[PDB]
């Protein structure tokens, strides 16, 4: 199998197996995508699949400033321009529907409220916020409040609404953000979940929320338009799990029964070493994939983290993964697909302009000529 040949992710047809990883850019004031955002995504429409920047299902699900959401009518309209543009350019695009859980700040929350989480354990993490009087970071994340059962029901409804909004905005589907220490992972992992009810303790209980979210979203828009991002060992956002194999194998055994479009896996620490581990034992990614496949899982297996041209080509050729998502290389290379096809040089990413600001370091990375 070639990295450059078409693929299928549930109901979504992909032109090739090069995926644009979700990348928060903080360039949508008021949680509403704008014209510059449309330019940015259109530039990258040769990707087999674009996964958007995390896009929250609600204001409660926001953790950073100037992030586009799916909860305002104006935001849905803004996204529609983006998906239309991507489609006209021959692309496909899914919304990474997001809830940050404890990773937020009161100034971003409705009513100036506490971020919500499975347990009231403050993260030692930071959020991108815009100084009331200029301008940009940093505050420690706020103390979170433990979710009640009723609160959880309200969030599930927000996931239904968000998935519905994604379809209204013309997305081809959604990727449920269940990675990088955010709300769903906060329930999954032991360091963040000290609940004594049906959502805490056992692996089955800790995965309960993830599976309810998946089932709610899949019921709303169709399993064949539903994917999910997972990150078994990442230390992102102050999270820790000492025994991820049984937990994550169980998760994908369950996902394997649900006819999903794709599973997107962050292999290692997000943006860090691929061989990262937290517990005593290394994570076995082959065993993890096997647990999905052996349960009947037929979703496209999209892998991420530290890939380059050669490792991506090799991983797809061997069948270890079905497709590869690139993060930082897509920031810097709108025509990454053509560059990789021709084995051309790449532009280097400029980290200082990843978050916030303007067109510089966003829409001005050049494509190659002709
Ligand atoms: C600027 C930036 C923003 C990111 N925002 C998100 C995000 O919104 N959602 C997500 O799941 N991962 C996010 N990540 C992680 C990337 O999707 C990806 O996992 C990471 O960059 C590693 O892949 P790479 O080695 O190809 O860059 C972000 C990464 C970067 C560099």
Author numbering: 2 to 371
What does the paper say about this structure?
We determined the crystal structure of the enzyme NerA, which has been shown to exhibit dual ene-reductase and nitro-reductase activity with α,β-unsaturated nitro compounds, from A. radiobacter. NerA exhibits a TIM-barrel fold typical for OYE-like proteins, and all catalytically important active site residues are conserved. Residues stabilizing the electron-withdrawing group (EWG; e.g., carbonyl, carboxylic acid, nitro) of a ligand in an ene-reductase-like reaction are a histidine/asparagine pair (H178 and N181).
Three enzyme molecules were present in the asymmetric unit, and the final model could be refined to R and Rfree values of 15.8 and 18.9 %, respectively. Structural superposition of the three monomers in the asymmetric unit gave very low RMSD values (Cα-RMSD for 371 aligned residues) of 0.160 Å for the superposition of chain A and chain B, 0.097 Å for that of chain A and chain C, and 0.216 Å for that of chain B and chain C. Larger structural differences are found in the regions of loop β3. Loops of comparable length have only been described for two other OYE like proteins—PETNR from E. cloacae and SYE-1 from Shewanella oneidensis. Similarly to these two structures, NerA exhibits the highest crystallographic B factors in this capping subdomain. The experimentally determined moderate stereoselectivity of NerA with 1-nitro-2-phenylpropene (54 % ee for the reduced S-configured product)34 is in line with this prediction. In addition, a relatively hydrophobic region can be found parallel to the isoalloxazine ring of FMN; this indicates favorable binding of the substrate's aromatic/hydrophobic part in an orientation that results in a C=C double bond reduction.
